[PDB]
Amino acid sequence: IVRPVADFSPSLWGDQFLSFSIKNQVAEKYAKEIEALKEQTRNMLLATGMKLADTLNLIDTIERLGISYHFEKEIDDILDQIYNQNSNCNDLCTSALQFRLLRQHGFNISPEIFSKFQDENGKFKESLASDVLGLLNLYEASHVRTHADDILEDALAFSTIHLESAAPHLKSPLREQVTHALEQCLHKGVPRVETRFFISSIYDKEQSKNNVLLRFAKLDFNLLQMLHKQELAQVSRWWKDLDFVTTLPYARDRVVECYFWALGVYFEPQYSQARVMLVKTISMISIVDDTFDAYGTVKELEAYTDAIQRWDINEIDRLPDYMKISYKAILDLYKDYEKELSSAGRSHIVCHAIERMKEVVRNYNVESTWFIEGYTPPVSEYLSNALATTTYYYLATTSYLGMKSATEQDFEWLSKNPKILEASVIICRVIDDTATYEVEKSRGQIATGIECCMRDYGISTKEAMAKFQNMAETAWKDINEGLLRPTPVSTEFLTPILNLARIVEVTYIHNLDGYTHPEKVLKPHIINLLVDSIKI
Ligand SMILES: O=S(=O)(O)C[C@H](O)CNC1CCCCC1
Ligand SMILES: [Ca+2]
Ligand SMILES: [Ca+2]
């Protein structure tokens, strides 16, 4: 039986992550100072008689520095006060920042705050073109729109064109901040990634920087980084002992990239257990994907799909040897999850992730049938299958497993495909389809997203990609609306879904395709987050 020729690049990391020995003295020193710095910072936040602009800038700085997870209650109370006092009497810079921070935190501040900055036609007053800080904050704000915010329709184009015009003559690090922003907006970036850039490239170089905050941010980042490196070591050893890199040589060797994904979903220490579970799932489902995509025959894949549905070690014998490997490994991983949640009494929730995995595999098999048949479905039918194959319903569900406060009701809500989840899935699907169209088209994938779209509507490749881009923009608005209070579950269970969408934007930036080819996009991020500490 002829199998395809292996074509994936080797892991580019080797063993450099396999063993990390934390320096307890250094760790405890950092933790001791951070405690002091944390309290100094709390008092900055709780200071009375601050002007609105000063308060917003403080909160914004603490958020960009990556240390706001220490001050969730404090920041919430303050933004809530600002929301309810409803003061509209400020300049563009403060107004746009006020708008972004409140919306990002679920406070539905009216977009009417921007009317004084527009003419009678809703277009921004062109006389604001010389106010760089206003334009920058408007630019960042333009990305948190919902469908109810069409008044802000012009904001992105307006701020973009004038920021571009001004940038070459700005002083540093404002110039670098603007240039970075135009390439990657804050709201749609991976939080650790934006934080690393902000601390090192911007705040560290600000003449006006607060030294207490800067020191706080650097220590905290480097301290959390020690934990992440410990996690990645523990995970790298797990993967090594599985040894798929030799027994399943057709499959991608990408556990580091998978860790980066999981780190993107949450970075905080309290989610350590959750992160480790999540990265194992992503690794394992990546193996299954490649089995369907680049090795298994139709008959093999059918048996594999059936065995998954039945979910029973008895079924291994129905499978070819090489499939027995991943199949047992899958069953065992979930038995590990169950035991790992036993003492917390949360073992019962693992079945939710299993049912989503079954769904992914069913749709993988459908996808294989389509390819073999040369079937090009209508867009609606394509999406009915291809949304699950992003794995994003599955990953979002998995993200909940290690979260100590995730309840059965939280899983029940997720299981109904709520709109914020569907939007995140849609974003992953259409961006991936736009990025990977050309190569899949060369591999004879008659049923790619863009292809289905072209045939269905009778439009060009260009027109199809534009339509897919609109679907992504619509979905972001839905995600943003999905964060507005009151929320159907705790915000803590929405942020993972938002972060999954950010993962997409970052991974396929400039329409590149980055997990399969981590050299392009992900390698600098991995080095910055998991290899190089921030120099103090
Ligand atoms: O759905 S496809 O277009 O064929 C390719 C999807 O982007 C695959 N999503 C990844 C699967 C491997 C683990 C990380 C997620
Ligand atoms: Ca695939
Ligand atoms: Ca793809």
Side-chain angles (χ1 to χ4, degrees):
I1 171 66
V2 197
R3 327 304 290 229
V5 173
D7 211 350
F8 299 114
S9 303
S11 162
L12 62 100
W13 306 109
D15 59 271
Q16 73 181 85
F17 297 117
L18 182 53
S19 166
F20 173 61
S21 304
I22 197 169
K23 303 196 281 187
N24 297 321
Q25 300 198 28
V26 182
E28 287 170 8
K29 184 189 212 309
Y30 282 18
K32 185 179 185 179
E33 205 186 333
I34 283 161
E35 288 314 299
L37 294 171
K38 178 186 302 174
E39 282 303 301
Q40 292 179 53
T41 298
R42 188 180 325 274
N43 293 337
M44 288 161 63
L45 277 169
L46 300 190
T48 57
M50 298 188 62
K51 298 292 185 171
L52 175 59
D54 290 338
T55 302
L56 294 170
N57 285 334
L58 178 59
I59 291 173
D60 188 38
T61 297
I62 288 173
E63 284 186 344
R64 292 167 173 273
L65 282 175
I67 43 177
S68 49
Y69 72 93
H70 290 296
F71 311 102
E72 295 189 358
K73 171 73 171 178
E74 283 83 4
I75 287 170
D76 190 67
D77 292 344
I78 294 161
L79 294 182
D80 181 68
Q81 204 266 334
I82 293 175
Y83 177 58
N84 283 286
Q85 77 186 0
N86 220 13
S87 50
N88 188 16
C89 23
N90 294 87
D91 44 72
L92 174 65
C93 181
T94 305
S95 302
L97 178 54
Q98 176 179 5
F99 179 91
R100 177 170 62 77
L101 295 183
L102 289 184
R103 288 300 191 88
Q104 279 185 304
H105 285 251
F107 301 103
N108 193 9
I109 172 167
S110 161
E112 295 273 18
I113 190 177
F114 297 102
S115 293
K116 69 165 69 50
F117 305 109
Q118 308 173 306
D119 56 26
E120 296 80 309
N121 198 271
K123 305 309 177 192
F124 279 89
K125 293 183 178 184
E126 224 98 64
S127 57
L128 306 172
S130 56
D131 170 23
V132 175
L133 292 181
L135 296 170
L136 184 53
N137 280 281
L138 179 61
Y139 171 86
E140 298 289 3
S142 73
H143 294 280
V144 303
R145 295 167 54 217
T146 75
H147 282 99
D149 302 319
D150 283 342
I151 200 198
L152 278 167
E153 169 177 40
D154 185 45
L156 178 56
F158 180 77
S159 59
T160 295
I161 193 164
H162 292 301
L163 282 173
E164 284 174 333
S165 206
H169 299 291
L170 301 183
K171 60 167 170 27
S172 299
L174 179 58
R175 180 172 73 185
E176 288 66 35
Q177 185 173 38
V178 171
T179 295
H180 177 84
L182 289 170
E183 197 189 344
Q184 172 68 71
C185 72
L186 181 48
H187 184 57
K188 304 183 178 183
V190 173
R192 276 292 92 162
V193 172
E194 297 313 298
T195 287
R196 177 64 140 97
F197 174 79
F198 185 71
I199 295 172
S200 297
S201 289
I202 307 306
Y203 204 62
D204 189 54
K205 301 181 168 177
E206 290 277 16
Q207 271 299 331
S208 57
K209 67 186 188 289
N210 182 289
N211 291 282
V212 166
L213 295 184
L214 175 61
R215 175 143 183 102
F216 186 0
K218 286 180 174 187
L219 293 181
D220 203 271
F221 190 91
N222 290 348
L223 186 56
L224 290 195
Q225 187 182 70
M226 297 176 190
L227 172 69
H228 300 150
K229 287 160 71 177
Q230 282 175 312
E231 291 168 356
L232 185 51
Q234 173 192 347
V235 155
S236 293
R237 166 62 62 194
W238 166 80
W239 189 245
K240 184 176 175 74
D241 296 347
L242 283 178
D243 195 31
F244 293 158
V245 74
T246 80
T247 56
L248 302 176
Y250 62 82
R252 290 171 290 204
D253 193 5
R254 301 285 185 271
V255 83
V256 178
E257 291 75 11
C258 292
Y259 183 80
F260 170 74
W261 271 28
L263 186 55
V265 169
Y266 23 47
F267 67 88
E268 300 95 324
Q270 57 262 32
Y271 298 127
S272 182
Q273 179 179 208
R275 262 194 304 283
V276 172
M277 294 174 113
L278 175 54
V279 59
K280 285 170 183 169
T281 282
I282 300 180
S283 276
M284 203 60 69
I285 199 63
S286 182
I287 297 287
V288 170
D289 184 50
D290 295 343
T291 302
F292 279 85
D293 254 20
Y295 203 77
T297 77
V298 170
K299 312 212 293 189
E300 294 181 330
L301 294 177
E302 274 290 340
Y304 201 82
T305 300
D306 281 328
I308 297 295
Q309 307 314 301
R310 304 177 185 274
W311 201 270
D312 172 24
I313 200 66
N314 280 268
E315 314 286 7
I316 56 191
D317 299 314
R318 260 182 38 250
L319 294 173
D321 289 17
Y322 84 95
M323 279 177 159
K324 292 192 181 73
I325 301 181
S326 50
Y327 189 73
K328 168 155 159 50
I330 288 168
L331 253 49
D332 290 349
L333 174 63
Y334 279 98
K335 282 295 167 181
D336 283 340
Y337 288 163
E338 289 172 2
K339 168 185 175 175
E340 192 184 351
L341 296 178
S342 283
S343 59
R346 309 179 62 243
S347 314
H348 58 278
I349 68 183
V350 170
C351 62
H352 297 289
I354 295 169
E355 294 303 299
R356 287 297 195 170
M357 194 194 197
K358 292 179 175 178
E359 174 177 51
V360 174
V361 176
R362 284 192 307 266
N363 292 21
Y364 279 171
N365 202 61
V366 158
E367 165 187 323
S368 171
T369 305
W370 285 355
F371 172 86
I372 264 74
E373 280 170 1
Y375 186 52
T376 304
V379 172
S380 68
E381 177 176 10
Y382 167 74
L383 290 175
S384 65
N385 190 65
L387 286 172
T389 64
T390 64
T391 76
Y392 262 27
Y393 300 106
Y394 177 44
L395 299 193
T397 304
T398 298
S399 84
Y400 287 8
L401 296 180
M403 300 180 64
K404 234 294 171 59
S405 58
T407 70
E408 199 64 26
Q409 281 71 9
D410 294 315
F411 283 95
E412 173 66 18
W413 171 81
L414 201 68
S415 79
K416 294 182 57 164
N417 289 351
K419 201 167 185 47
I420 186 168
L421 211 212
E422 202 107 84
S424 189
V425 175
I426 281 166
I427 286 156
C428 182
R429 176 78 277 147
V430 299
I431 288 181
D432 174 275
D433 286 357
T434 287
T436 68
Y437 171 60
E438 280 306 324
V439 288
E440 285 175 337
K441 176 178 168 46
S442 303
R443 301 177 62 232
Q445 240 114 88
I446 33 74
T448 52
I450 292 300
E451 190 78 23
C452 295
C453 188
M454 297 173 68
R455 180 170 188 175
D456 200 352
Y457 298 100
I459 61 187
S460 72
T461 297
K462 208 181 200 296
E463 294 168 310
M465 277 178 181
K467 204 177 194 72
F468 270 40
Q469 192 194 345
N470 276 20
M471 299 174 57
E473 287 164 1
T474 296
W476 267 107
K477 292 173 176 169
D478 288 339
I479 283 182
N480 291 336
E481 186 180 333
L483 303 169
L484 299 182
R485 300 167 181 223
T487 56
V489 299
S490 260
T491 293
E492 186 187 10
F493 306 111
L494 304 179
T495 306
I497 297 168
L498 166 67
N499 281 344
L500 283 172
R502 294 161 159 169
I503 287 306
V504 179
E505 299 286 345
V506 171
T507 297
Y508 304 86
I509 200 174
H510 300 317
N511 219 35
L512 257 28
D513 177 23
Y515 171 83
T516 311
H517 291 89
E519 166 89 277
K520 319 293 107 66
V521 193
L522 298 194
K523 179 180 170 188
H525 297 327
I526 289 173
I527 288 170
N528 287 338
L529 296 192
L530 294 160
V531 181
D532 293 341
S533 60
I534 301 179
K535 298 306 164 290
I536 304 177

